């Protein structure tokens, strides 16, 4: 029926997800630390995500299977075995933090490139903050008694012991909602909008300058008197002086020589001879085709590459947001519109618990799925496979 099949499928998913996570994270870690071409900005953060995934998937699923197939927490005959029911919730709430703040950093840094020590400092700060924020959940769980098989045996559960724990259990659900699924989903969107606007502006400016140069060339080629060449060369000079600023300190020498030839042609036109002005402007085509086309192509390719990395940088966050929502959606129904007298009675009371189990399962499966997409969507990793 429902319960036996639920237990069997839970054991199966735990057993498979264990090795799936170890394989994925070990593979990604090896590639990151060995491939000299792989190492870059985002790759350190991705390796951090993989390692945070591994440090949760190594131990936490086997003990869940133990509880599934035994009904009793292991190591109950000793005295240390209590703190496991503290370590089990300690790790989990840590790992999600690592996955959350990082998906803000990927949004923070990716925009900055479009607009080392810093990465190490950010990683250390993120890890320290996530570990610090997960101590209440460790201090909350503690052993509780009951009578079973004739002995006072124990089940790991949350008990109201010290006023700090009380104040924690009042608002833990809403604090989790307001932190782990609210701030990133807005910050990433804001940074995405900023990045898209900036990229569009840069493309527009570059295209406008190049088009100005080409159309002015064509106009001078068909010119007939002094005024036309004068105005066209003035526009050319303005466009070249505006475009020279985009060069990062090769290309600057080319822009300087272009402006110099424009100045010579302008002087010849000022002297009053149109034909000599056309002859002077003839040489501009060679400098164009030998200095400007290359830097235009390089800039276009580089901006393409930045878009390409942002693609996966945000596919990760969209997958995370899709995965975490249903559990909170099912919890909030049992907290705002709880099955007091509202609807369906026996159906809803168990329905909320059923989707809570599904939410737990999907939240755990997020701790394995991310490598799959990184390889499948990014494509760059495939090249390294």
């Amino acid at each position, epitope marked *: 029926k429902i319960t036996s099949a639920f237990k069997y499928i839970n054991t199966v998913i735990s057993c498979t997800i264990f090795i799936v996570g170890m394989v994925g994270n070990a593979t990604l870690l090896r590639i990151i630390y060995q491939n000299k071409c792989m190492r870059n900005g985002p790759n350190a953060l991705i390796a951090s995500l993989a390692l945070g995934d591994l440090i949760y998937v190594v131990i936490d699923l086997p003990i869940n299977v133990f509880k599934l197939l035994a009904g009793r927490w292991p190591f109950d005959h000793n005295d240390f075995g209590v703190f496991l029911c503290k370590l089990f919730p300690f790790l989990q709430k840590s790992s999600v933090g690592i996955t959350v703040l990082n998906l803000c950093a990927l949004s923070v840094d990716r925009y900055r490139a479009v607009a080392p020590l810093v990465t190490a400092i950010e990683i250390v700060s993120i890890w320290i903050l996530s570990f610090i924020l997960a101590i209440p959940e460790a201090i909350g769980f503690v052993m509780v008694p009951f009578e079973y098989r004739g002995e006072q045996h124990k089940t790991c559960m949350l008990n109201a012991t010290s006023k700090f724990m009380e104040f924690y259990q009042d608002v833990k659900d809403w604090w989790l909602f307001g932190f782990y699924f609210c701030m990133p989903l807005v910050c990433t969107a804001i940074f995405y909008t900023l990045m898209t606007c900036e990229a569009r502006r840069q493309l527009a400016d570059l295209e406008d300058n190049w088009e100005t140069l080409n159309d002015n060339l064509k106009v001078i080629e068909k010119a007939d008197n002094a005024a036309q060449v004068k105005d066209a060369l*003035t*526009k050319m*000079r*303005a466009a070249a*002086l505006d475009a020279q*600023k985009a060069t990062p300190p090769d290309f600057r020498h080319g822009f300087d020589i272009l402006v*110099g030839q424009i*100045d010579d042609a302008l002087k010849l036109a*000022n002297e009053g001879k149109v034909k000599e002005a056309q002859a002077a402007a003839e040489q501009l085509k060679t400098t164009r085709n030998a200095y400007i086309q290359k830097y235009l192509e390089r800039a276009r390719s580089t901006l393409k590459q930045r878009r390409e990395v942002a693609k996966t940088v945000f596919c990760l966050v969209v997958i995370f947001a899709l995965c975490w929502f249903p559990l909170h959606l099912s919890r909030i129904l049992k907290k705002t519109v709880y099955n007091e007298m509202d609807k369906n009675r026996c159906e809803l009371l168990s329905f909320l618990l059923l989707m809570d189990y599904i939410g737990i399962n999907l939240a755990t499966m997020n701790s394995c799925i991310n490598p799959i997409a990184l390889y499948f969507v990014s494509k760059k990793f495939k090249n390294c496979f």
Partner: antibody, heavy 124, light 109 residues
Framework: EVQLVESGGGLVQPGGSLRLSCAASGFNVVDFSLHWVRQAPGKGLEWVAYISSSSGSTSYADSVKGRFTISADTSKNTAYLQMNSLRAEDTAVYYC?????????????????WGQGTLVTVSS | DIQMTQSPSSLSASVGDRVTITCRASQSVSSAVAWYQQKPGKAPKLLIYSASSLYSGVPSRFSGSRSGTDFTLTISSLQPEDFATYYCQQYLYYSLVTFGQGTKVEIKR
């Protein structure tokens, strides 16, 4: 010790001729271009003429074309301006300014050194 | 050709006040603007070049900015020495040089 002095100002009759001077100390005329700027009394600023000795290039404003001539002397390190056929509008204060050449910062620096000025009066 | 318009024409402000002068260009001179200061009976001196840059020796209160084809000169502290006439200039090329009309700052009472 960059320094410029002008001379030659005075009172002239309508339809006359006059000659100014611009002496430069602390630099060479073969590295900078020279400009003249006007200021009518109780009015704004106006551009007049331009000389470059290295390329031997000259340019004039629209209102003063055909009546002014501009030249330079590298041995004496001076610039010369000659006016003919003066009118009553020509009375103003004249300034001599220097400007660099294109490659680099001197072009961006614009007019950075100016003379003290010379007064011309067209009187009857 | 390439006319330049200076919007304010006479400003009354006291010491410790903020003043802003605007300048507009007809064509699209890239960043070739300069700001000049003139006191009565004296030659002009340079303050700002390339639409944002400080000459050596000028006070650090002076500032300039560019937005499209509109240029703005700002002064945050109005010391007594800062009461004179101010001029705008564009220097795209040697034979194409024009000046603005001029803006005068005067005491308020």
């Amino acid at each position: 010790e960059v320094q410029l002095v002008e001379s030659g100002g005075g009172l002239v009759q309508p339809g006359g001729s006059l000659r100014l001077s611009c002496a430069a100390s602390g630099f060479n005329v073969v590295d900078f271009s020279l400009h003249w700027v006007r200021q009518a009394p109780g009015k704004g600023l106006e551009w007049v003429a331009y000389i470059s000795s290295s390329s031997g290039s000259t340019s004039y404003a629209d209102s003063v074309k055909g009546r002014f001539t501009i030249s330079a002397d590298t041995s004496k390190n001076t610039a010369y301006l000659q006016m003919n056929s003066l009118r009553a509008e020509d009375t103003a204060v004249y300034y001599c300014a220097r400007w660099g050449y294109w490659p680099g910062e001197p072009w961006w620096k614009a007019f950075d050194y100016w003379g003290q000025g010379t007064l011309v009066t067209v009187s009857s | 050709d390439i006319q330049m318009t200076q919007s304010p024409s006479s400003l009354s402000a006291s010491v410790g006040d903020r003043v802003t002068i605007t300048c507009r260009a007809s064509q699209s001179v890239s960043s070739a603007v300069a700001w000049y200061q003139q006191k009565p009976g004296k030659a002009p001196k340079l303050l700002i070049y390339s639409a944002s840059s400080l000459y050596s020796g000028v006070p650090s209160r002076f500032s300039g900015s560019r937005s499209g084809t509109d240029f703005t000169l700002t002064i945050s502290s109005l010391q007594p020495e800062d009461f004179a006439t101010y001029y705008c200039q564009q220097y795209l090329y040697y034979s194409l040089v024009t000046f603005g009309q001029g803006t005068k700052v005067e005491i308020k009472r």
